[PDB]
Design a protein around this ligand. Sequence first.
Ligand SMILES: O=c1cnn([C@@H]2O[C@H](COP(=O)(O)O)[C@@H](O)[C@H]2O)c(=O)[nH]1
Ligand SMILES: O=c1cnn([C@@H]2O[C@H](COP(=O)(O)O)[C@@H](O)[C@H]2O)c(=O)[nH]1
Lengths: 206, 216
Amino acid sequence: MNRLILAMDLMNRDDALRVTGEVREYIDTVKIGYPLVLSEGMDIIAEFRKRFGCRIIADFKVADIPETNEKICRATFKAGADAIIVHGFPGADSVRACLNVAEEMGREVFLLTEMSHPGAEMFIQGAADEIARMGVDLGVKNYVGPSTRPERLSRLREIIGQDSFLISPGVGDPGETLRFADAIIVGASIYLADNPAAAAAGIIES
Amino acid sequence: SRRVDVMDVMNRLILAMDLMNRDDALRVTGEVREYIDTVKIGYPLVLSEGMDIIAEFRKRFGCRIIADFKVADIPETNEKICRATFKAGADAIIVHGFPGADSVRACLNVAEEMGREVFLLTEMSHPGAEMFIQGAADEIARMGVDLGVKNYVGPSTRPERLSRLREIIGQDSFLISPGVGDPGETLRFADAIIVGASIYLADNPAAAAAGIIESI
Ligand SMILES: O=c1cnn([C@@H]2O[C@H](COP(=O)(O)O)[C@@H](O)[C@H]2O)c(=O)[nH]1
Ligand SMILES: O=c1cnn([C@@H]2O[C@H](COP(=O)(O)O)[C@@H](O)[C@H]2O)c(=O)[nH]1
């Protein structure tokens, strides 16, 4: 919806439920990560799904060995998550382990190629194109890129093709980002704003 | 005492508790407490039973707890994850070094504010680690040293790489490693080895542990 995904990283149920309920008419997918889950419990995922009728992407940056990755994905889909975000840096077997569980449980995997923060240039950026092609080779259809580096985003989009689905987070220009990505992830700009719906609204009007 | 600057975990053996149900996890851990005083708990157990399981292990077994959360997000998110983890009672947290120096400093900042420890993961043990991680491992380790990191995680599956990592971090740093490898040789470089399934899936957990320590 509106090609906008809310990154709900508040750490207490009250605030999280309030802000999410307040911007519901603008977005239809909520990305829930460890800040909220480690503070309130995995049950928060099914509750969000039920109360808001939205799809949930568990942003867990899965980055372990294949056997542990299997366990994490199983617990996450059992909790009701529609998709899970997995790091590609650990290699093909760790990613394939996640894809196998997603296939068995009827869910989806999003492959994180390049990260949006400064530190990303140190090691991740140098591997991003290759990580993206690895996903293509494995048959990954969903991807996550950096909104802070449209130059990198466009390369990534070229690699994965136009049939793929790509989302990006970080500070950028909604206009130019939604030029390579199917949707942008916005967090603090909304959930810390005095008026979240307005901030969300303020964002779409671009 | 082998080292006088930092006390060894009991028998230099760390249990990786990745069972997913509270009952089985608490049972196997209580059964090997005679040989191990340090337990590594990860997401398989925490996402199945809740973060409160960490305080429960501490209360019941008096063990040291390392949260193996492979922290791998941007600085702001990393801070929130570490804060929540230390609040749950973990003595240390494992964070990935590949997302960059700022993501790591974020974790160290919280660890400092709460008086806890950060372990930096440099090279992973599985086959896929050869694709991208191994190529950056030496650099990640040097980055750790420059940031002041004193605790590291390495691969038991590759003794030659463990030695090389030990070379980079110095003899004053603390190093632990997981994966299948010979305890004897691994312990020439690592201060402690991590063992999971070989112990927790055994018919007799205490026996598997006793056996491994004798192997050494
Ligand atoms: O490269 C990446 C991958 N993921 N995220 C995540 O997307 C959200 C962005 O939120 P923000 O708009 O408040 O900074 C947060 O949950 C964050 O961990 C990034 O910021 N950058
Ligand atoms: O490079 C690494 C980093 N961490 N672990 C973790 O250490 C434990 C090893 O368990 P295992 O002995 O049963 O294979 C598991 O929790 C696993 O996620 C590895 O195996 N390799």
